Coordinates of C-alpha atoms in Angstrom, one line a residue:
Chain A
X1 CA -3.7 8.8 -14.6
X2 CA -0.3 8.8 -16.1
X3 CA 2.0 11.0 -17.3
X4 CA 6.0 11.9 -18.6
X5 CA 7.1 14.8 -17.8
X6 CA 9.9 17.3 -17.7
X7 CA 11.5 19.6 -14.9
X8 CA 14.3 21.9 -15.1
X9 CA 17.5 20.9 -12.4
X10 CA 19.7 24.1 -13.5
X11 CA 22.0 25.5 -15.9
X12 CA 24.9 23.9 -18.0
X13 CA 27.9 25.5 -17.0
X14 CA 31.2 24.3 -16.0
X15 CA 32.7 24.8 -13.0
X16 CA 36.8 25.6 -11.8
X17 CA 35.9 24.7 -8.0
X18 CA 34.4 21.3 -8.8
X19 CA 35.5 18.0 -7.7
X20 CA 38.4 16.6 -9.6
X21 CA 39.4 13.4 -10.4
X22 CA 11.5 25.6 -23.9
X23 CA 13.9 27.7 -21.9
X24 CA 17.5 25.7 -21.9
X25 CA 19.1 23.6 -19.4
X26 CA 19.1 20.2 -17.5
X27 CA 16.1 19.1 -17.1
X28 CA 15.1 15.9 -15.0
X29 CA 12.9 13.5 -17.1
X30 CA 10.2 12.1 -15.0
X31 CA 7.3 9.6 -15.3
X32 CA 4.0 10.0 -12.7
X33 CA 2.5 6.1 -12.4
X34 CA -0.8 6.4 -10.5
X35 CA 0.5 6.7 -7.1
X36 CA 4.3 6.8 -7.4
X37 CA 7.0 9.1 -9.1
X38 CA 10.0 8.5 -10.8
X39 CA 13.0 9.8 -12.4
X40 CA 13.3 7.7 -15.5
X41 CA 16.5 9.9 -16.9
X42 CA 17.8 13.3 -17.4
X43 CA 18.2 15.3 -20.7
X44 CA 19.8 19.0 -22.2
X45 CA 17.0 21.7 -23.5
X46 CA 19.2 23.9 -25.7
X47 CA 18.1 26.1 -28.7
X48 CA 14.4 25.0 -28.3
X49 CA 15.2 21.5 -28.5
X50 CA 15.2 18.7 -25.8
X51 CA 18.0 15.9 -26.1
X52 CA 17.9 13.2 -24.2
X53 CA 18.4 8.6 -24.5
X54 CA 15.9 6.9 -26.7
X55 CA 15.8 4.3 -23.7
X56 CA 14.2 6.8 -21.3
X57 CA 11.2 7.8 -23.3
X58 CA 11.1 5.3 -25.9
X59 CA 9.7 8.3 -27.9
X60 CA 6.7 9.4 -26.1
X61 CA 5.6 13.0 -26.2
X62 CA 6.3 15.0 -22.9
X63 CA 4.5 17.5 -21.3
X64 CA 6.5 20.5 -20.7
X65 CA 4.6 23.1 -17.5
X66 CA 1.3 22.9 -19.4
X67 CA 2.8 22.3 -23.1
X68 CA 3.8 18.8 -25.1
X69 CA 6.3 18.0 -26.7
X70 CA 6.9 15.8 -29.6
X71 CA 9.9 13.3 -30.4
X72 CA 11.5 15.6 -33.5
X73 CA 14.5 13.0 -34.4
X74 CA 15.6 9.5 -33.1
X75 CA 18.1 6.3 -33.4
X76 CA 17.5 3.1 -31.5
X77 CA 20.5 1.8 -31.9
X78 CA 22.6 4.7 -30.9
X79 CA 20.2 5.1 -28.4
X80 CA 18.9 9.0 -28.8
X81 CA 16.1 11.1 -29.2
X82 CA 15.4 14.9 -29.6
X83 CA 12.4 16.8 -29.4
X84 CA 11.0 19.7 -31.1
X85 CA 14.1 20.1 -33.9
X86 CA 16.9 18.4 -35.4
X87 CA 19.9 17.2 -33.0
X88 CA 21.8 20.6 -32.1
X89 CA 24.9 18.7 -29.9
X90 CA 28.0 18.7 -32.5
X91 CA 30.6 18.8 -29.9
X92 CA 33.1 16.2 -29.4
X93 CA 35.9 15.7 -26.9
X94 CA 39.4 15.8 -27.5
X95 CA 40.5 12.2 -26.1
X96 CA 42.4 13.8 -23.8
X97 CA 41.1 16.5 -21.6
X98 CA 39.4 16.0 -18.6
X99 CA 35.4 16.6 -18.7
X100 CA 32.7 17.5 -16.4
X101 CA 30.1 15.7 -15.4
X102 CA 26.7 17.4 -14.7
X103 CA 25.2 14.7 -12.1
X104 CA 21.6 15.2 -12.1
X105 CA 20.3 12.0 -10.0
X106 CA 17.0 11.1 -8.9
X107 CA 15.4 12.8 -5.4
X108 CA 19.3 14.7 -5.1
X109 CA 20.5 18.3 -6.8
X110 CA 22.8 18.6 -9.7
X111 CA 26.4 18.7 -9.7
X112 CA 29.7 18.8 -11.4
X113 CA 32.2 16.4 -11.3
X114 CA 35.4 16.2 -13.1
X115 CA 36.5 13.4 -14.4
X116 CA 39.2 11.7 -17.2
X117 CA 36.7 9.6 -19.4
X118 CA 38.3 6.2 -20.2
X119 CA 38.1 4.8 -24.0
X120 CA 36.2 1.6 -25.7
X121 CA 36.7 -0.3 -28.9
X122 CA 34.0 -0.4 -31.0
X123 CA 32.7 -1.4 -34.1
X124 CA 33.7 2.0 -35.7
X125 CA 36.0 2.6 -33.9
X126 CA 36.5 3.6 -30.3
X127 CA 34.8 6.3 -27.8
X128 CA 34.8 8.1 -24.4
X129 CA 33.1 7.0 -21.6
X130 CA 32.4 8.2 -18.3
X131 CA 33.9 5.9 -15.3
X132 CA 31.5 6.3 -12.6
X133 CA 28.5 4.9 -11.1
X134 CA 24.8 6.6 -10.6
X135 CA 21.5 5.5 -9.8
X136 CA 19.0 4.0 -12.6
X137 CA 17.7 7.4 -14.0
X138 CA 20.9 9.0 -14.3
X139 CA 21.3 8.7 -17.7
X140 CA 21.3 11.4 -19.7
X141 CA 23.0 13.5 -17.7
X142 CA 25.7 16.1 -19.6
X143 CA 29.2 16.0 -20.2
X144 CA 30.4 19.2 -21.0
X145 CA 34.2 20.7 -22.0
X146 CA 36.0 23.3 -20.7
X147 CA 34.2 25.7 -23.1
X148 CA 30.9 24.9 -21.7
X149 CA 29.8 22.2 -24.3
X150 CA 27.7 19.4 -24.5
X151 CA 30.4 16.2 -25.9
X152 CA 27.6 14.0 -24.7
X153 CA 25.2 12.0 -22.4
X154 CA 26.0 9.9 -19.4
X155 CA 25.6 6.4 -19.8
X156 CA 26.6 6.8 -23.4
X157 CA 29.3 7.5 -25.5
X158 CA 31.1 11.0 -25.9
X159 CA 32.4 11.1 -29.5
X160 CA 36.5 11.6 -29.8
X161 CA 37.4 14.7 -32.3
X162 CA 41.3 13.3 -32.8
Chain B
X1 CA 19.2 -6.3 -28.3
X2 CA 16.8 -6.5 -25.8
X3 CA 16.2 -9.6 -23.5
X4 CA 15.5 -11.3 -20.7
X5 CA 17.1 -13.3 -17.4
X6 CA 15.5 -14.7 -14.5
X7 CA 15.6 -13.0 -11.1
X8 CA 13.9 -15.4 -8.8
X9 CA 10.8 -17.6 -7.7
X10 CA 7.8 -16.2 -6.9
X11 CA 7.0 -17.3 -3.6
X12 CA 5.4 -15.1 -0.5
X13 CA 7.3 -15.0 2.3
X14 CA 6.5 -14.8 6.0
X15 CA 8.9 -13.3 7.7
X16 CA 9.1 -10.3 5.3
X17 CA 9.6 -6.5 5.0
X18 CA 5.9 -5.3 6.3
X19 CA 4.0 -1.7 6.1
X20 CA 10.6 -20.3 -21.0
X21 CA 11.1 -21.6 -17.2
X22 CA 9.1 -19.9 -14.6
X23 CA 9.6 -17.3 -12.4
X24 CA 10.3 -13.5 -12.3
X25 CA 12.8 -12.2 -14.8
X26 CA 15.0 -8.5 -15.3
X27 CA 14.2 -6.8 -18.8
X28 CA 17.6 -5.0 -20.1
X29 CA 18.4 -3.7 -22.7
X30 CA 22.2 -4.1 -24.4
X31 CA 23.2 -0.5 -25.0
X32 CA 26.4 -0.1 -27.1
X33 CA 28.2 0.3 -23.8
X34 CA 27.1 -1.5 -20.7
X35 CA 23.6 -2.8 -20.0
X36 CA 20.6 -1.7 -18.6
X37 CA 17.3 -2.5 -17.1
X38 CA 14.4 -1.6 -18.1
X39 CA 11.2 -3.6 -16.3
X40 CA 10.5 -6.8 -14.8
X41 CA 8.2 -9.4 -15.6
X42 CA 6.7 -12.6 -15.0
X43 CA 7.1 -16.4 -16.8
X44 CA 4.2 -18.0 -15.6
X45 CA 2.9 -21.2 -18.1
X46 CA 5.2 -20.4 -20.5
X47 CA 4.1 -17.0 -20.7
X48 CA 6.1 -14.1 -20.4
X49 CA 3.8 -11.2 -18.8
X50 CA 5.4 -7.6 -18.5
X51 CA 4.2 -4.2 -18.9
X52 CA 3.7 -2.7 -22.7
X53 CA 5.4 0.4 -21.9
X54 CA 8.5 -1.5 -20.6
X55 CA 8.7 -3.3 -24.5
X56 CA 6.5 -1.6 -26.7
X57 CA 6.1 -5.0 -27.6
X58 CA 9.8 -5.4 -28.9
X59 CA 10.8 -8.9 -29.3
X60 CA 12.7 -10.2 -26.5
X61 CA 15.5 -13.0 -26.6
X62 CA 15.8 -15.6 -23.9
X63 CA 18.8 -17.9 -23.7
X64 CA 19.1 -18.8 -27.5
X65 CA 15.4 -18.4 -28.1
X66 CA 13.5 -15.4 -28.5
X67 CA 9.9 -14.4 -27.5
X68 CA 7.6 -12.4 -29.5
X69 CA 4.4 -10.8 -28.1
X70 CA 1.5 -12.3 -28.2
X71 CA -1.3 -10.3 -26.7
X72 CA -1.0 -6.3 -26.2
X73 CA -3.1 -3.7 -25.1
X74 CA -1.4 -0.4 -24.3
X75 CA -4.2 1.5 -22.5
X76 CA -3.9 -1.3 -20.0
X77 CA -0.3 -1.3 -20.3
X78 CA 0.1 -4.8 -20.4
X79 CA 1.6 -7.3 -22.6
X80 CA 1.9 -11.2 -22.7
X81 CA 4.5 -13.4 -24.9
X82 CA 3.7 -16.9 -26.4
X83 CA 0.2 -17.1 -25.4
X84 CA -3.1 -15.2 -23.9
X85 CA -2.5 -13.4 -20.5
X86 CA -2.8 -15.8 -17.8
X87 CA -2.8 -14.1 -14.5
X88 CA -6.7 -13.9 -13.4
X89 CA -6.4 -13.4 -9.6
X90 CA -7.3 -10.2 -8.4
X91 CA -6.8 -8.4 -5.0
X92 CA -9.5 -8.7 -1.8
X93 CA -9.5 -5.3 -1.7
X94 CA -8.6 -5.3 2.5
X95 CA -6.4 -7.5 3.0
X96 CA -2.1 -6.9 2.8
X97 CA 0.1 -8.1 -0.5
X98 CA 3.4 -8.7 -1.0
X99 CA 5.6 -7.1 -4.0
X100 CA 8.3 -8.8 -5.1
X101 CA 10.6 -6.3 -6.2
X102 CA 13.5 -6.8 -8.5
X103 CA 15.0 -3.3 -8.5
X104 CA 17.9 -2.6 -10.9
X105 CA 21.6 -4.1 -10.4
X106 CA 20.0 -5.1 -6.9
X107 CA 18.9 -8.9 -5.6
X108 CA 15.2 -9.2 -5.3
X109 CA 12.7 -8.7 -2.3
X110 CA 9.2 -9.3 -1.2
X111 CA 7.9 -6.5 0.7
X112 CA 4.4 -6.4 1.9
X113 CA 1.9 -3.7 2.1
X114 CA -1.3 -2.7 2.1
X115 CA -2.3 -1.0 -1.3
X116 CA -4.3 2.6 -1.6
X117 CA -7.5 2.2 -3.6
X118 CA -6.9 5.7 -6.1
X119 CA -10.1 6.6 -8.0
X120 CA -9.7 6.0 -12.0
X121 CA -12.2 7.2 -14.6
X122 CA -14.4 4.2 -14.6
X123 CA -14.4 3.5 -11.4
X124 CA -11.6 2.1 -8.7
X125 CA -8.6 0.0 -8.0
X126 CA -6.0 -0.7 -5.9
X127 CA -2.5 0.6 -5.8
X128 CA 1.0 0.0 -4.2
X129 CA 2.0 3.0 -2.5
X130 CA 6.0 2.7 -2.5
X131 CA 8.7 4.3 -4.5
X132 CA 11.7 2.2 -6.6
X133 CA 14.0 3.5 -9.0
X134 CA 12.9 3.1 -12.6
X135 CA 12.9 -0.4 -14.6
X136 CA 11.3 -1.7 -11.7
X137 CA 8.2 -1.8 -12.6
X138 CA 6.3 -4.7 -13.9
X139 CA 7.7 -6.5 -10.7
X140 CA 5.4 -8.9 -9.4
X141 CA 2.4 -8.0 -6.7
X142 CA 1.6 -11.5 -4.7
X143 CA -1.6 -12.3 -2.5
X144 CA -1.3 -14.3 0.5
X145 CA -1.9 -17.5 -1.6
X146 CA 0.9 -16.6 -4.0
X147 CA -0.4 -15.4 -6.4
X148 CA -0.1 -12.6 -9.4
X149 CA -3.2 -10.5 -8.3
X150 CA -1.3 -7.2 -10.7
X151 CA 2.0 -5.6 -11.8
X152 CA 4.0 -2.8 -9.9
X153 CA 3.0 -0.2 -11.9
X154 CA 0.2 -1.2 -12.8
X155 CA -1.8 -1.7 -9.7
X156 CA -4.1 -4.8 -8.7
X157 CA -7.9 -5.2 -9.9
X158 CA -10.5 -5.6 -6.8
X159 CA -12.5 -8.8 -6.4
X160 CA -15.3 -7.3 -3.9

């Protein structure tokens, strides 16, 4: 058999002592291949929807405890899928701040680390990204603000407000 | 932009780890931002054999060329560019095998094992019991002779 599933690593909060530079949360996205197990990538449940990279499910359903779940929304291009509604993640960093990354790699516990995001040039026109390195199956993992938010997924970009 | 670049020849190896040119070759996937890997395969022929799930049968670009699927069956989970699947052999069913694994951003590896046989519907095959971080699979599983009796992943057909 095979199957892609979902498990819940925690809440999405921040955190002040960190280290500087349906129901919602992270949850670890998984695939079971006959005899092995892996984390493929990470993604945010929030408001009954599941946000995670296009590249980690390529849109297949999930099974959620003993529910599925249905790709809702997605873009290829940007990368991005949701499940269940519309995308919900409006947020945006300041292109300034510092931000805190909510680590959830594969076989280790979640985490937040704190980090100044550096900026790329792009097409139209230039974005935050996270500078650090984590095992394949990383990705989407959440950046949050200060207030708690969700700016964006690791190993993409976080959209600048100004 | 998803494509392909070559990771190694596929060649057993003795002293090992134990329990269009061809070759074995990375999948990845150019994200906006950096790069990343998403399955191996195997050019064998002229014939580009990877795992459906790892594509979805996406085109693929290779140098300045670019490969597009030519056999597909997703049950099997299995995929073959520019001609018929080619890869025939099949496992003994007692004897140990060799994956060549070409985990992400790391050099590849033969490592040599003897497979589980899991119970499927209809009726039983062989299966690799180790663990690699994701977008390895498809990687190449080697018999003693050299030769591509499955895909990690996939596990290996038994002869008898």
């Amino acid at each position: 058999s095979v199957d892609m599933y979902i498990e819940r690593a925690g809440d999405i909060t921040w955190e002040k002592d960190a280290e500087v530079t349906t129901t919602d949360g992270v949850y670890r996205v998984m695939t079971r291949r006959l005899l092995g197990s892996t984390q493929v990538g990470v993604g945010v449940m929030q408001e009954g929807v599941f946000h995670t990279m296009w590249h980690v499910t390529k849109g297949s359903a999930l099974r959620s405890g003993e529910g599925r779940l249905d790709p809702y929304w997605g873009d290829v291009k940007q990368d991005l899928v949701s499940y269940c509604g519309p995308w919900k993640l409006d947020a945006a960093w300041d292109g300034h701040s510092e931000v805190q990354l909510l680590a959830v790699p594969p076989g280790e516990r979640a985490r937040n680390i704190q980090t100044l995001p550096g900026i790329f040039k792009t097409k139209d026109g230039d974005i935050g990204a996270v500078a650090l390195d984590y095992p394949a199956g990383t990705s989407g993992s959440p950046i949050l603000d200060k207030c708690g938010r969700v700016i964006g997924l690791y190993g993409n970009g976080v959209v600048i407000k100004n």
